[PDB]
Design an enzyme around this catalytic site. Structure first.
Site, PDB file in Angstrom:
ATOM      1  CB  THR A 180      -6.523   7.756   5.861  1.00 18.16           C
ATOM      2  OG1 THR A 180      -5.178   7.308   5.688  1.00 18.16           O
ATOM      3  CG2 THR A 180      -6.549   8.982   6.769  1.00 18.16           C
ATOM      4  CB  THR A 181      -5.673   2.426   5.071  1.00 18.69           C
ATOM      5  OG1 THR A 181      -5.170   1.877   6.295  1.00 18.69           O
ATOM      6  CG2 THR A 181      -4.728   3.496   4.554  1.00 18.69           C
ATOM      7  CD  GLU A 232      -4.385   9.366   3.184  1.00 10.32           C
ATOM      8  OE1 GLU A 232      -4.157   9.179   4.402  1.00 10.32           O
ATOM      9  OE2 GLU A 232      -4.908   8.504   2.443  1.00 10.32           O
ATOM     10  CG  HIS A 235      -1.167   8.533   2.413  1.00 15.10           C
ATOM     11  ND1 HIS A 235      -1.980   7.461   2.114  1.00 15.10           N
ATOM     12  CD2 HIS A 235      -1.004   8.518   3.758  1.00 15.10           C
ATOM     13  CE1 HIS A 235      -2.297   6.827   3.229  1.00 15.10           C
ATOM     14  NE2 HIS A 235      -1.718   7.448   4.240  1.00 15.10           N
ATOM     15  CG  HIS A 253       2.254   5.620   6.628  1.00 14.39           C
ATOM     16  ND1 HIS A 253       1.956   5.333   7.943  1.00 14.39           N
ATOM     17  CD2 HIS A 253       1.191   6.304   6.143  1.00 14.39           C
ATOM     18  CE1 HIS A 253       0.770   5.831   8.243  1.00 14.39           C
ATOM     19  NE2 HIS A 253       0.285   6.425   7.168  1.00 14.39           N
ATOM     20  CG  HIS A 278      -0.271  10.287   7.649  1.00 21.48           C
ATOM     21  ND1 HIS A 278      -1.254   9.625   6.948  1.00 21.48           N
ATOM     22  CD2 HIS A 278      -0.546  11.608   7.518  1.00 21.48           C
ATOM     23  CE1 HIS A 278      -2.085  10.502   6.413  1.00 21.48           C
ATOM     24  NE2 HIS A 278      -1.677  11.714   6.744  1.00 21.48           N
ATOM     25  CG  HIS A 316      -1.741  -1.180   1.400  1.00 22.25           C
ATOM     26  ND1 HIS A 316      -2.585  -1.632   0.406  1.00 22.25           N
ATOM     27  CD2 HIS A 316      -1.870  -2.047   2.430  1.00 22.25           C
ATOM     28  CE1 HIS A 316      -3.197  -2.725   0.817  1.00 22.25           C
ATOM     29  NE2 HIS A 316      -2.782  -2.999   2.040  1.00 22.25           N
TER      30      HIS A 316
HETATM   31  C1  LIG Z   1      -4.272  -2.908  14.747  1.00 22.15           C
HETATM   32  C2  LIG Z   1      -5.406  -2.899  13.730  1.00 22.15           C
HETATM   33  C3  LIG Z   1      -4.795  -2.858  12.332  1.00 22.15           C
HETATM   34  C4  LIG Z   1      -4.506  -1.799  11.608  1.00 22.15           C
HETATM   35  C5  LIG Z   1      -4.028  -1.335  10.480  1.00 22.15           C
HETATM   36  C6  LIG Z   1      -3.659  -2.492   9.675  1.00 22.15           C
HETATM   37  C7  LIG Z   1      -3.864  -3.819  10.227  1.00 22.15           C
HETATM   38  C8  LIG Z   1      -4.425  -4.023  11.540  1.00 22.15           C
HETATM   39  O1  LIG Z   1      -4.598  -5.325  11.995  1.00 22.15           O
HETATM   40  S1  LIG Z   1      -5.816  -6.247  11.365  1.00 22.15           S
HETATM   41  N1  LIG Z   1      -7.116  -5.456  11.219  1.00 22.15           N
HETATM   42  O2  LIG Z   1      -5.427  -6.756  10.031  1.00 22.15           O
HETATM   43  O3  LIG Z   1      -6.034  -7.400  12.269  1.00 22.15           O
HETATM   44  C9  LIG Z   1      -3.069  -2.354   8.265  1.00 22.15           C
HETATM   45  C10 LIG Z   1      -3.109  -0.899   7.705  1.00 22.15           C
HETATM   46  C11 LIG Z   1      -2.773   0.130   8.823  1.00 22.15           C
HETATM   47  C12 LIG Z   1      -3.862   0.091   9.972  1.00 22.15           C
HETATM   48  C13 LIG Z   1      -3.535   1.089  11.116  1.00 22.15           C
HETATM   49  C14 LIG Z   1      -3.374   2.536  10.584  1.00 22.15           C
HETATM   50  C15 LIG Z   1      -2.413   2.648   9.374  1.00 22.15           C
HETATM   51  C16 LIG Z   1      -0.946   2.631   9.949  1.00 22.15           C
HETATM   52  C17 LIG Z   1      -2.552   3.825   8.409  1.00 22.15           C
HETATM   53  O4  LIG Z   1      -2.125   5.075   8.977  1.00 22.15           O
HETATM   54  S2  LIG Z   1      -3.038   6.430   8.817  1.00 22.15           S
HETATM   55  N2  LIG Z   1      -3.223   6.681   7.326  1.00 22.15           N
HETATM   56  O5  LIG Z   1      -2.293   7.488   9.480  1.00 22.15           O
HETATM   57  O6  LIG Z   1      -4.336   6.255   9.376  1.00 22.15           O
HETATM   58  C18 LIG Z   1      -1.696   3.418   7.185  1.00 22.15           C
HETATM   59  C19 LIG Z   1      -1.788   1.880   7.123  1.00 22.15           C
HETATM   60  C20 LIG Z   1      -2.757   1.600   8.284  1.00 22.15           C
HETATM   61 ZN   LIG Z   2      -1.442   7.510   6.471  1.00 24.04          ZN
HETATM   62 ZN   LIG Z   3      -2.927  -4.997   2.773  1.00 24.46          ZN
END
Ligand SMILES: CCc1cc2c(cc1OS(N)(=O)=O)CC[C@@H]1[C@@H]2CC[C@]2(C)[C@@H](OS(N)(=O)=O)CC[C@@H]12
Ligand SMILES: [Zn+2]
Ligand SMILES: [Zn+2]
Length: 257
Positions: A195-196, A103, A93, A91, A116, A61
């Protein structure tokens, strides 16, 4: 699996993640004239002197520079926050062109990219538990515009060819995030979400007014990364940003006049 394409992009997310249509989603457009100056807001406290980066990863991503968050080595405090928030990773965007990529938008203006710096509330023990709380995360957003090069970002840029595809990772120690901050810490703040996916509404957003400038060469190296995994058709990693969402019943507060 969710992504940023015509068939799995931001518009498709609500199907697997219903909260995509929630009451406090991010990002949002920052209307500088409707944002409320709050004199009680405090200066932001960024203590990054003992930060310990561990590695950089291409997650398919974007790419992540992770830090050791097992101690209060790099924390964010003050500003609109209560308590301490530990830096877990940062990270970016970015877009396919300099005219898009951020974003958050300011008076509808989109920047070339957005950094971010993700922090979680120490009162929740770990990041996993933090995301389940309304005030579990604090993400410091910093806009990037194309112009003069940002010295502090070069170490990051030069290692990207080593993590070109999804799944690849590499050691990345002694990186100092202080080199990624603008002169001023003036900011806007509002309650929002990741945001994801999972798009959890656990974020106190802190967006800096002053963007940092990076060179066209630096952002170009960002665009050379791949969304796909090694040995698959190449799809450049670009435009991995979510568009602005409805503010609804929220008020953006400004720490400066
Ligand atoms: C701890 C919950 C969780 C969160 C996140 C992911 C997997 C996660 O675990 S899951 N849902 O697969 O069991 C993968 C994508 C991650 C997200 C937490 C927030 C993240 C760091 C985002 O940061 S952001 N844009 O500042 O909100 C970018 C990728 C995102
Ligand atoms: Zn982000
Ligand atoms: Zn993924």
């Amino acid at each position: 699996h969710w992504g940023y394409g015509k068939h799995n992009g931001p518009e498709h997310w609500h199907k697997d993640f219903p909260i995509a249509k929630g009451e406090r989603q991010s990002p949002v457009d920052i209307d500088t004239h409707t944002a409320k100056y709050d004199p009680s807001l405090k200066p932001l406290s960024v203590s990054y002197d003992q930060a310990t980066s561990l590695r950089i990863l291409n997650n398919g991503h974007a790419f992540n520079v992770e830090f050791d968050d097992s101690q209060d080595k790099a924390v964010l405090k003050g500003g609109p926050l209560d308590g301490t928030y530990r830096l877990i990773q940062f990270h970016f965007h970015w877009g396919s062109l300099d005219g898009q990529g951020s974003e958050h938008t300011v008076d509808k203006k989109k920047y070339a990219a957005e950094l971010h710096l993700v922090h979680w509330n120490t009162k929740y023990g770990d990041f996993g538990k933090a995301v389940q709380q309304p005030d579990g995360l604090a993400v410091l957003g910093i806009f990037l515009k194309v112009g003069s090069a940002k010295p502090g970002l070069q170490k990051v840029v030069d290692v990207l060819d080593s993590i070109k595809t999804k799944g690849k990772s590499a050691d990345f120690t002694n990186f100092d995030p202080r080199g990624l901050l603008p002169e001023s810490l003036d900011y806007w703040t509002y309650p929002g979400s990741l945001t994801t996916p999972p798009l959890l509404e656990c974020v106190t957003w802190i967006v800096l007014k002053e963007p940092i400038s990076v060179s066209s060469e630096q952002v170009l190296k960002f665009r050379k990364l791949n969304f796909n995994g090694e040995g698959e058709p190449e799809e450049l990693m670009v435009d991995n940003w979510r568009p602005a969402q409805p503010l609804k019943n929220r008020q953006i507060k400004a720490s400066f006049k």
